[PDB]
């Protein structure tokens, strides 16, 4: 699109390699640090899309 179609997405992080033909729809925040995080985006955990 001239203005830029941004409705196509792709997952960036996942804790494990998915098995053949798997799909996933969960959009829960992906944590990187050992200390668990929750709520919204911030440090050591982000949006996986």
């Amino acid at each position: 699109k001239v203005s830029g179609n941004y409705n196509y997405l792709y997952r960036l992080f996942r804790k494990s390699n998915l098995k053949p033909f798997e799909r996933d729809i969960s959009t829960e925040i992906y944590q990187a640090g050992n200390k668990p995080c929750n709520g919204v985006a911030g440090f050591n955990c982000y949006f996986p899309l």
């Epitope: 990187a32 640090g33 440090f43 050591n44 982000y46």
Partner: antibody
Framework: QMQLVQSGPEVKKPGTSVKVSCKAS?????????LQWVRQARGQRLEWIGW????????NYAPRFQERVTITTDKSTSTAYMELSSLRSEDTAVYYC????????????????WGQGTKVTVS | EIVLTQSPGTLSLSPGDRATLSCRAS???????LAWYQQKPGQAPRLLIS???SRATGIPDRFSASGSGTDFTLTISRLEPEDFAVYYC?????????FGQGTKVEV
Amino acid sequence: QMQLVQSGPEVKKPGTSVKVSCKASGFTFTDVSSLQWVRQARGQRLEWIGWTVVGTGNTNYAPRFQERVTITTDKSTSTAYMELSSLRSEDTAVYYCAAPFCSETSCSDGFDLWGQGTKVTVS
Amino acid sequence: EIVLTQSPGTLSLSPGDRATLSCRASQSVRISYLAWYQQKPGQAPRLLISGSSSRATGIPDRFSASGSGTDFTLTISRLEPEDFAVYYCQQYANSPWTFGQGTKVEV
């Protein structure tokens, strides 16, 4: 070794812009790894400027620095670019870029790596 | 929007003694997003304790973190003559992060 190198001190003139960069020694920007920038003046407290995410592309900026500084990252070259416009005498200080030992999509909350810093002075 | 106050302002203790420092926050309470730093003159600051509950790489057992509430505390068991530096508390959990002012220890 896990170490970060940065350019040397520079002197510039008013009415000009400065591009600042710092590189690593075998460290990869990847996606999970994120680097922040700090500045230290002569006998002054440390101030936070901004940190960016190489993978998602999200950036954070200070409200004071929301109009004349830009931070970008390039994973392929694993470099960080700061464009600073209208550098005054108050902007003459030492810059440091810090990132954690962030590999294999896992890393703690502490930034161990610490660059030497660039002494930027504009007269 | 978070201001940290580091106390005491200055120190002068015999080497090898036990010292403790504290720092003050005014925003919401968080204990795992605080870090302690030392900056030597002519060198970049170095991290000592991250998250107030874990040590960094190569950090000796000299530095011990404490505190549960809004206060944040650190303790040094022995003041070996190279430990003289400045201390900074830094928070992570809030809207744009901000350091402290700095606690200086003297001989």
